[PDB]
């Protein structure tokens, strides 16, 4: 079974509405808020915050520069969810397919962000994407603590 899944939910200090705003409509702000991790988010096709938009990421993992091109496969405004499909990039040297879902819970008094990965490894030997999940969690923490009082 080359297929895998990972799920991590974290509680956040900041407004879930703003977190989803960023992930849906203003993804480029992550370069500002997590500049060690994300160097560029560049829209290639479509419009920010729409299904089918195509986005290019310049990012760094363990000090090494990587790129990905993703398509926004799905949006659910009611559940504050967005689904990214990796279509090109460094990850495709390890994974045949890779999808990342970000979903924000803005009830009740606590807000949280859940990251879900669905992937298929090219080979049985390929590592599970723990390092990427740590990355996504770090980005989350960088957003929630950006320019705090
Ligand atoms: Cl950017
Ligand atoms: Cl749409």
Curated annotation (Swiss-Prot):
Entry comment on modification after translation: The N-terminus is blocked.
Pfam families per UniProt: Bet_v_1
Superkingdom, natural source: Eukaryota
SMART domains recorded: Bet_v_1 (SM01037)
Keywords of this entry: Acetylation, Allergen
Coiled coil feature spans: none
Single Gene Ontology BP annotation: defense response
Description of how the protein assembles with itself and partners: Monomer.
Family listed: Belongs to the MLP family.
Protein name: Kirola
Source organism of this protein record: Actinidia deliciosa (Kiwi)
Source species taxonomy: Eukaryota, Viridiplantae, Streptophyta, Embryophyta, Tracheophyta
């Amino acid at each position: 079974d080359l297929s895998g899944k990972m799920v991590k939910q974290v509680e956040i200090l900041s407004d879930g509405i703003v977190f989803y705003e960023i992930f849906r409509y203003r993804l480029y702000l992550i370069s500002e808020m997590s500049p060690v991790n994300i160097q560029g988010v560049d829209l290639l096709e479509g419009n920010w915050g729409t299904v089918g938009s195509v986005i290019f990421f310049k990012y760094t993992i363990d000090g090494k520069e990587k790129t990905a091109k993703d398509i926004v496969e799905a949006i659910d405004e009611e559940t504050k969810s967005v689904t990214f499909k990796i279509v090109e990039g460094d990850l495709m040297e390890l994974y045949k397919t890779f999808i990342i879902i970000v979903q924000v819970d803005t009830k009740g008094e606590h807000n949280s962000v859940t990251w879900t990965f669905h992937y298929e490894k090219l080979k049985e030997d390929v590592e599970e994407p723990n390092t990427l999940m740590n990355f996504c969690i770090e980005i989350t923490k960088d957003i929630e603590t950006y320019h705090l009082k």
